Design a protein around this ligand. Structure first.
Ligand SMILES: Cc1cc2nc3c(=O)[nH]c(=O)nc-3n(C[C@H](O)[C@H](O)[C@H](O)COP(=O)(O)OP(=O)(O)OC[C@H]3O[C@@H](n4cnc5c(N)ncnc54)[C@H](O)[C@@H]3O)c2cc1C
Ligand SMILES: Cc1cc2nc3c(=O)[nH]c(=O)nc-3n(C[C@H](O)[C@H](O)[C@H](O)COP(=O)(O)OP(=O)(O)OC[C@H]3O[C@@H](n4cnc5c(N)ncnc54)[C@H](O)[C@@H]3O)c2cc1C
Ligand code: NA
Lengths: 312, 309
């Protein structure tokens, strides 16, 4: 009937599954909620070349290998979504499944990842390989000696734009808000750049090209509904990522504006609530790698093991 | 002369993962693996907690990571590094038996930290047959058995506590008459009914049946009296040695123990700008291959970011 675990892990990605490995091997009863509506960012990627011990591996195959390992080590994998948690009382409560079952957990690890915010756009699909890019340093050959567009106002985008001033002749920053969701040091570097032109209250309407390269971009003001075109050799998407923390309530866990869970005792994975830990992309915007997420998972699980043990 | 974009000192999980990330970023990169140093993963047999491998041998894992780094285009140099110049840029790495110098625009230190093993009768005989230095890593040797943990620090207290869930009984054997650990850990360990604490004693002899450890003999240091414990495993928890001797004290900020301090969490930044540290040479807390590899990636990304000046 009622499930009580020592460690409850919300997320079945690299961070979550790795956490499951360590928690289960500690001989602490452990379950991992993998999700059903949610999936790992790794399933969407085709070829993984930078995970240690694999020259090349498919994301789905990498994820299957790690899942099998978590099962073998004795973690219980549940293909169920978490709807809410309770952090006011211990044992912690986790509400999940189609019938809103409650699982009791003595410690929580949150590894719910993040999503891409993929733009349903005319030319986003057409020019994703060519012209449109998600990484400025990776596709900087497109920017060199050209006019360029960067989307979003945040740390990711603000650093992409300042970098592309070294290469691009002109950098256009398109924000969908009144101001930036970013640091005052980064806004000062951006707003004192002559090669940057900051466009506020705007969204990307269409990406135009010759079929090979992007030659112009169309923008429409949100309030106005008016659209204008900009000549550019490439569009650099840098909107940012959405941590999958919508199941959380305001004041449960300390978070930033974007919703990333904050880490309160570096280099540990401790959150603002004791016995609650966070790992992977849901608390890391800087790095965003499978091996990095996996590293956090291990750290979170070991943090939870030490914390639980001191409670006895 | 060799000039690289990133210089990585160490060819373990952290070092090699940095090499992979830096090489794939199309940066000229070389990794100093060592001749008279080797990765600590070569000392262990069965790795069961590295993600994507249910069971893999330590050497086999390392070979797979090495080949990967080589394939991504990182130059693996099998040579020891004796010193570095960190006052000027490019940074200089002095390595090899002919004291060749290599220049690097960025540095990544990942020399790891060696777990101490103490010599006694049968220690080397039964290494990885019930004798180990990481309880988290080799808990398969402890399952359903009585075991020994040696040491009186925080690590010995953690490792013994971690083992009470796995083993039927834990013996903590202390050379001294007193712990050198936090008041919190000493209280926990002494109130744990599954632990017996032994003071003023050292490990006389590790005993087995040819396949596995089956008993550990303990000798008291004060009176010389011998005692024999019914232990099926022994765990060394008497400290780690960060492999940071090639540094001159003062060059980089460090612990008393010699761990390189990280100065801008959660990054891999050291006290000197342009120099990053990854893995167990800057981590005394977790000490896992997956954690180390994670930090290596973070270090290589910190370096690339820093190189966009
Ligand atoms: C296009 C693309 C390509 C990439 N390529 C690479 C690459 O080649 N190499 C690399 O290292 N990294 C790559 N990354 C980054 C990498 O995929 C992520 O950093 C990594 O997957 C993060 O791991 P995670 O465990 O934090 O989250 P994820 O791997 O995304 O896992 C999130 C998990 O949480 C679950 N979840 C979320 N919400 C809930 C809920 N409410 N209830 C239950 N479960 C929930 C999901 O179902 C999922 O199991 C790529 C990312 C993208 C977008
Ligand atoms: C018995 C035992 C079993 C273990 N089992 C596991 C396990 O199953 N799973 C797990 O995750 N972890 C395990 N660990 C922990 C693991 O060994 C470490 O966390 C990991 O090796 C650290 O990786 P690293 O890259 O930081 O350092 P290392 O892997 O130790 O690599 C250090 C590198 O630096 C090089 N180097 C050092 N000094 C110099 C120099 N002066 N010049 C040039 N090169 C140099 C070395 O040759 C080496 O290549 C175990 C440890 C022990 C003792
Ligand atoms: Na269920």
């Amino acid at each position: 009937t009622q499930r009580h675990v020592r460690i409850g892990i919300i997320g079945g990605g690299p961070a979550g599954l790795t956490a499951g490995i360590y928690a289960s091997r500690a001989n602490l009863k452990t379950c991992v909620f993998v999700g059903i509506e949610h999936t790992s960012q790794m399933f969407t990627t085709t070829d993984v070349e930078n995970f240690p011990s694999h020259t090349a591996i498919k994301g789905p195959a990498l994820m299957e290998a790690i899942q099998n390992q978590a099962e073998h080590c004795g973690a219980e994998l549940l293909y169920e979504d978490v709807h809410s948690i309770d952090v006011s009382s211990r044992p912690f409560k986790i509400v999940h499944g189609y019938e809103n079952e409650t699982t009791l957990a003595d410690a929580l690890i949150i590894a719910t990842g993040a999503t891409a915010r993929r733009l349903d756009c005319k030319g986003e699909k057409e020019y994703w390989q060519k012209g449109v890019s998600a990484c400025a340093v990776c596709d900087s050959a497109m920017a060199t000696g050209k006019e360029v567009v960067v989307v979003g106002g945040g740390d990711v985008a603000c650093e992409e734009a300042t970098y592309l001033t070294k290469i691009a002749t002109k950098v256009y920053m398109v924000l969908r808000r009144d101001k930036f969701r970013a640091s005052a040091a980064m806004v000062k570097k951006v707003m004192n750049e002559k090669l940057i032109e900051i466009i506020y209250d705007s969204a990307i309407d269409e990406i135009k090209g010759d079929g090979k390269c992007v030659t112009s971009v169309s923008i429409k003001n949100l309030k106005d509904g008016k659209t204008r075109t900009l000549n550019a050799g490439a569009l650099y998407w840098a909107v940012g990522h959405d941590p999958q923390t919508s199941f959380l309530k305001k004041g449960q866990l300390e978070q930033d504006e974007a919703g990333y869970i904050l880490l309160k005792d570096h280099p540990t994975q401790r959150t603002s609530v004791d016995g609650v830990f966070a790992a992977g992309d849901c608390c890391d915007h800087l790095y965003r790698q499978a091996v990095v997420a996996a590293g956090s998972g291990s750290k979170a699980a070991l943090d939870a093991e030490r914390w639980l043990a001191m409670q006895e």
